[PDB]
């Protein structure tokens, strides 16, 4: 038999590289409270069933020079299901939310939200359905109110104090979904001219010209930080490709984006990429690479042509980082393979 | 007032086979620190200095009265004090204090009056290692003499503890990771020098003459399965001379280090540095080592190389880094070169 | 016999020429707290054994103008064996350690750490292995969240408040050991173009470029202080260095960096160095002056080539200030040597 | 049991001639730890941690009442503290609490005022060596003022104890030396290369000449008498580079060894390291020194080898290992290897 | 102080394997004196008379609770008293006060009261080994009826002493060897006159033919392995004839010695007595075998020597003595000279 305690501390809940690009109703913090955010938290809250949040104290900070024009609004909203308005209208709701400041980029902001009487789990349910409002108190929104005139990076930190019960012990946190680092720039995959080189690729184009080839240096100014070989994530809705060559036909569902080797094992490239059930593993979908069974149970490659439908991704996209079996990695094994900046 | 008062109860050592253990060897012979719990470890890396109220060892043995042989369990008083390695550790062990012989098929409950202290939770990662400071003693369960049939034995620990001056921190800076087999060696000869086998990594069974180290002996030798980007820094570093026109230069061999051959189908492993050009630990292949020199331009001057010979047995304890020289976690090395799961270590 | 007694005062604990330089993660301050650290309590603490802390008060001011965007993280880990995490992940590690606070590079932060029923010795162990934690009750980081974008430099003070116990004189404090003042420069030495003029000499490489003598105001540049022609620092790992000439051959173990006379007794040069058993003294490995005794006991210097491994050192390295017999000097005698800026 | 409380009074220190003690110097310096004394030292062996209750140290200094002159002794309450090496050390330690002066002629029993802290009863066998641990301080004994004629001075201790925690050590001792007299030092040469006592160790006094060691000169180095199966480890390695027909080999020097010289009725010392080959440590001699190649056969092609000149002095700490680098017992060392009777040892 | 009150509990016998041992024969025959405990034993040391208040003998039998057969167990109250090589051991010991039986299986507690007499602590060193004044008696374990299956017994002991008058123990500690192994002897042959090992010990098997020591064998018959330092004493001397060209010598073999043998990388053993030129112990060789004269001068005019046949059994207790027959310490002896760690010794 074990005990429930009352834990006090405090943590980094969410770092920025200046999102100063982002413009005004963007949310360049908007994540929901969870003990999985926290490091020390979730740590202790990982050798409890359920938490109970009596105090939860946030500070922005924005490490932008008193030069830098523009401001924004921080606050918490008391729902896990809430989700704000579209861009330009979201200010005036986040303000309408108790314990909710208005402030130009240089300053800092103090939330101190009460959730008592609230007894919450410790976790997002394995089985069954994402029931978010049984775990989640609430998110804690930054939203850009007039976007910021130079090199604007932002912090929260989280100053909590909580009850924990009914003692059990959890796996390590899954990797979480990423998105972009800068609203200014898209992944893109163009499959139109058919006999183009780079025509399964994602290539990043800055919103304004001609879209470029993934250089790492270039991935990790979109990402946050640099790719290895190794890297494969999941796609939010898959991009539809044609394979075919001599009498065969067959289409894949392009599930991932896979990091592949370029040219004899000395560089890396991105492609569409999707689980080949010869292989047992993703892989980039290259019709000359591209195996199948046949009714004979045989494997076979007879593809040489291929037909990629156009795709775009945003700063607002949500890709998952995934082995190549398609397993969520832990956390910790992420931030070891992917050190942020 | 940041401190609190944590119960709970764990799993020390998992199920084993005391019937394939010797006389005189341990089953357990474990330092108490909070990072053998899963329970109170998890919380105990949220905290800086511990006390231990309370500890029960519980000696599990799910055997029938038809065998015969019994154990010996006992708690050493200091962290310090090392049992001594023989068929001597019972007299010994038996003469502390708080020690237990029973036949194997009866279980036991061992409540440990520990001293009232406040240790730090974790070993010191700056100075000396004063053991003293972080570990109030080892725990140990010893076979008096070996049980007459399959008799399996399991460890739990009721423990209570105080946790104060709250920091954070993850499972383990590094790994350490030694061989599984005791009947091998590994080797590096360089004594042939017209050879294309010296500098290489290659395992000797001890009586045997020594053959190259492949995926499947080093899978017998190490318990997991290496591959591309596997590297170690060695306990010991190799001493390495490399040479060509009007050129010379000594390099310390301070890793073994995975690499790939004839296409990459196949993957062999060599003595290894950190290469100050690249910033990466490389290989030590003559034709492949790079060098600045005074004018800051990159040259790859060397055409031989001698490697001094040196040996590792199952007592050589290796630590993985990634390449870039970073020491790889014990969470994430578990997961990119699983073996079997046992509990304890 | 004598009496304890209980001291209330403050010091500068710490003083950066702006290391803005210092990329994201990196320490700029983190220092073992000790009453060697401040002048006044180090004179103090000096006349007892024991000292006990009751309360330490840090005020980290950053001189940066308010135009210099990018922040800082301060805090107290309450651990003296206790090392910080690899660069970009030691902030949320340190922000968990309680009375850790971010902040612009432009506003100050203040910490009130309490470390009583505890009681330290007062000086690390002379006799014995250095057990850190029996004379120090942590250490205090400033980590630089987000590189500054101009002059920043930083400042600590502290404002103490102590017991001291069991009366007894010490000895002077000897100079601890010393690193670089800017993260962009690295000192090297080069071995390689064995018909090079400068072949054993330090020199300063800017991590980009071709590297350069070390003139005296470079020396000073990278290391904050001007350097004298009794300049002699021991380093962090022993460079390998091998003496040849006629059937004769010795390998030369170089433990230090000494300052020697460059052309005529009017110039300064720096130089791999080791002890040399027939002067007993610590001199630069130049083979036509490198002597030896041989088994006669006679003093010969037969030595013409040598060739030296080449080496690097970095911001992160620590050389340690000693005279030419390898004796630590004293801190007064090293803060009159070498004034610092 | 597991408590006990333990009085007695034995001689820490034997008799010492204040006379040859140059102004300053300690005649006696000792750290309290219970094996100071011989019927504490046996019984805290078998406890693990101590608590000084009384201690005081009776001085019996017996110079004639004519004879001029005082001692200033006291207790630095410090383990790991260690006084100046000079005539400032008085000065220093008067300013020490319970620190005193008192002619060569009076003797005192000076009572100290330990901590009500409970020590560890034994040095750290595993881990690092905090003194600080299991030391509640030093004991010391300067001459303030050189005496005119002889004057013979000891110390012994009333001493009370509790000894708590119940468990026995081994106890695995292991010793280690240093030169007893200063007055020389012996080194190695590796020049010239043509020469027989080449990497040999030999003591060469202020007086510049080297020489082979008697062994009689060993005898007044080191304070015992040399013996066929001596061995010691080195602080510092020395690289020897072994050389034959197209081979080459580095060579760390661990240790210097006695071996026989000429048919068996000589003794030499030489560098030596552990051979791989012989699993024992051996005088790295080129004709004699075997080594593995790539097909795992043994041989010895050297012929000639390259020898780093090193001195070692009074200053440097030896440690005595049987071949395999294996440490020796306090008492087998002090059996084999006997110096003169003093206390402390 | 000069008293104390002492409470333990030690290890008094380890593991021992009763279904190897033929019936009547004792497992457990171990006189109590104070040495036989560990943390008895050493404080013991600090002190000169001893008076054993409780001594309760937990006689650990683990055999499966199948296994039949039974165990007589007792404690005989003469030191100096010895039970009968035979069957009728057990009902002569069941004769004896507060003797029992009980299954191999069923472990028990038997408490022993000891006369109210104090003892000294420790065997004579001066004057006659009278077992009486320092043993109050032998404590037994006999087998009644032989188990059929694995059948472990150990011993502990919870005692509780007063020690009385304190005094010091140097102490000078001395073994006394036999033979393991009782299946074969060692021996001596002085014909023929004519071969190369005459008067050399060899080992003679039940199997007739006797052969040299390898000395693996000699590792067989003593429990150790040997040692070109070994030397020891012999219980009965043998008679050894020197003769040459015109003189004649008798001489007393007192000693077995080893000895280099062809040039230093063998061993041989010879039987030895201390020389007077030398002094010491050499083995008796007509030609290394020097003496003095009427003049003073030193001769060695020895051709031949005439050895005298002799036979050494298990039963036959050697002492071991460095050269100049002088006493090696138990603890010294039992480094150089490891047996397999038993209990007691
Ligand atoms: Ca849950
Ligand atoms: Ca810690
Ligand atoms: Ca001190
Ligand atoms: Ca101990
Ligand atoms: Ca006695």
Redesign the interface.
Known sequence: ???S????????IV?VVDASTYDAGSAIVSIPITPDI???LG??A??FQRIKYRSLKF?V????????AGGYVAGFVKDAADVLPTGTASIPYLMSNTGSFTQPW?KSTVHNVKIPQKLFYTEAPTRGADAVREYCPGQFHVLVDSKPS????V?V?LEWVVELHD?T?RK?SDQTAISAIVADHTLNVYGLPATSNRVGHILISPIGQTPKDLTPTRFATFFGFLPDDKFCVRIPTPVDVVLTGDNVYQSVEATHIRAYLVNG?LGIDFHLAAYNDTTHTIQPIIPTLWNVYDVTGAVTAPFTSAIYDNHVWTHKDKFVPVSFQDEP??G??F??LY???
């Open positions: 038999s074990s005990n305690i009352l834990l006090k501390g405090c943590d980094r770092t926290a490091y020390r740590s202790t990982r050798t500070r900070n924005a490490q932008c020079a008193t030069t830098t240089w130079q090199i604007c990076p912090t930190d003692a012990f390590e094992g990695i832990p910790t094994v931030d070891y050190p942020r900046s």
